[PDB]
Structures are given as structure tokens and as C-alpha cells.
From Swiss-Prot, chain A:
Protein name: U2 snRNP component IST3
Note: Present with 922 molecules/cell in log phase SD medium.
Parent-protein start and end of this portion: 25 to 138 of 148
Record GO cellular component, one term: U2 snRNP
UniProt keywords, alphabetically: Cytoplasm, mRNA processing, mRNA splicing, Nucleus, RNA-binding, Spliceosome
The organism of origin for this protein: Saccharomyces cerevisiae (strain ATCC 204508 / S288c)
Swiss-Prot record, chain B:
Family: Belongs to the CWC26 family.
Quaternary context: Belongs to the pre-mRNA retention and splicing (RES) complex composed of at least BUD13, IST3 and PML1. May also belong to the CWC complex (or CEF1-associated complex) composed of the U2, U5 and U6 snRNAs and at least BUD13, BUD31, BRR2, CDC40, CEF1, CLF1, CUS1, CWC2, CWC15, CWC21, CWC22, CWC23, CWC24, CWC25, CWC27, ECM2, HSH155, IST3, ISY1, LEA1, MSL1, NTC20, PRP8, PRP9, PRP11, PRP19, PRP21, PRP22, PRP45, PRP46, SLU7, SMB1, SMD1, SMD2, SMD3, SMX2, SMX3, SNT309, SNU114, SPP2, SYF1, SYF2, RSE1 and YJU2. Interacts with IST3 and PML1.
Organism for this UniProt entry: Saccharomyces cerevisiae (strain ATCC 204508 / S288c) (Baker's yeast)
Domain of life (superkingdom): Eukaryota
Function per UniProt: Required for efficient splicing and pre-mRNA nuclear retention. May also be involved in positioning the proximal bud pole signal.
Localization (cell): Cytoplasm; Nucleus
Species lineage: Eukaryota, Fungi, Dikarya, Ascomycota, Saccharomycotina
Spans through the membrane: none
Protein name per the record: Pre-mRNA-splicing factor CWC26
Amino acid sequence: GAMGNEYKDNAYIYIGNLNRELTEGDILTVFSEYGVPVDVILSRDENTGESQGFAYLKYEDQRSTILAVDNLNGFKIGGRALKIDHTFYRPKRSLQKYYEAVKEELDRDIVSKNNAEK
Amino acid sequence: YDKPAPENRFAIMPGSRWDGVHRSNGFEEKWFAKQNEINEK
């Protein structure tokens, strides 16, 4: 599970087979109980837009994503079965405050326990 | 004791944003309702 990298709050899920009229509010309400996300991303065609066909929302907890998945997986809504799946894409990169994250600033005080117990 | 069937472990409480609209995913949900609905013990 991405060993040596351990990504932070980067939990994202792919939502397909959704109603065209389905808006962000509807999506939030549906997933609201099943782990309401802090942000919703909707794909749009720059050529025309309007339609999406793809959408991704950020979950507060990566473990909570299991709920909506096993819950809305194959679930029928409006005559359409929802298709939930784990994503793999990363959000827009931002090199600013993350600068302070450079080097093991914390890391349990540079591994206080050191190498195993004395 | 062997459980009758698998279910959700993390019981995350609902939020206001949920609007309070009906949202179901499994009939087993009846089990959770029964636990919450206890007037005899």
C-alpha cells in the first residue's frame, strides 16, 4: 500500500454511472452520511463542458471510504447503478508551505526510540 | 459467537448536510434500527 511514501490525506474515489442532473449538492447529500467529503471535483469538457461523466471527492478518512464503497456499490439510484472505485491520481501540486515539510523535522524527534530497544 | 452476517463497523454519525433524505444501501440496516429501538431490558 504505497510503502516508503505513505501519502497523507489523499483519499479519493471514482464515481461513475451518475445522473446527468445530479449536482454537487446531491452528491454531497448521498455521501454526506457515508463520510461527507471536504471537497467535490467534477470533470468538464473545455470544448463544451455541461456534461461530466466523471467526478471525484476528497474523504476526511481513507477508511471511511470503505463505507460508501460497499454501501453505494451496485446500489440503484434513479434507475442507475452507482460505480464506486478507488482513484490513483494526485491533486494539483502546491510547493509553498510544504517547504517546511522538507527533511525529517519531526519524525518522532528523529526516532527517539532509535534502533529497537536498548 | 459466530455472527449472522457482515456489516459496517465504523458507525459514523450523520451530518446536517445530509438534508435528512432517505438513503439505503442494504436491508441489513434493519439490524441497526433494532439495536437503537430498545424499550425493554
